[PDB]
């Protein structure tokens, strides 16, 4: 998974938190 502020699509929270939808950032 990714980290805090990767890059990443706003409806796919791909990070290991879940987060994404930082303008496409985690």
């Known amino acids: 998974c990714k ?3 990767q890059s990443c ?3 796919s929270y791909d ?5 994404c939808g930082r303008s ?3």
Do not use: A
Request: positive net charge; aromatic residues 0%; contains cysteine.
């Open 9 to 11: 699509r706003k409806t």
């Open 15 to 19: 990070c290991c938190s879940g987060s």
């Open 24 to 26: 496409g950032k985690c």
């Open 3 to 5: 980290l805090k502020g």
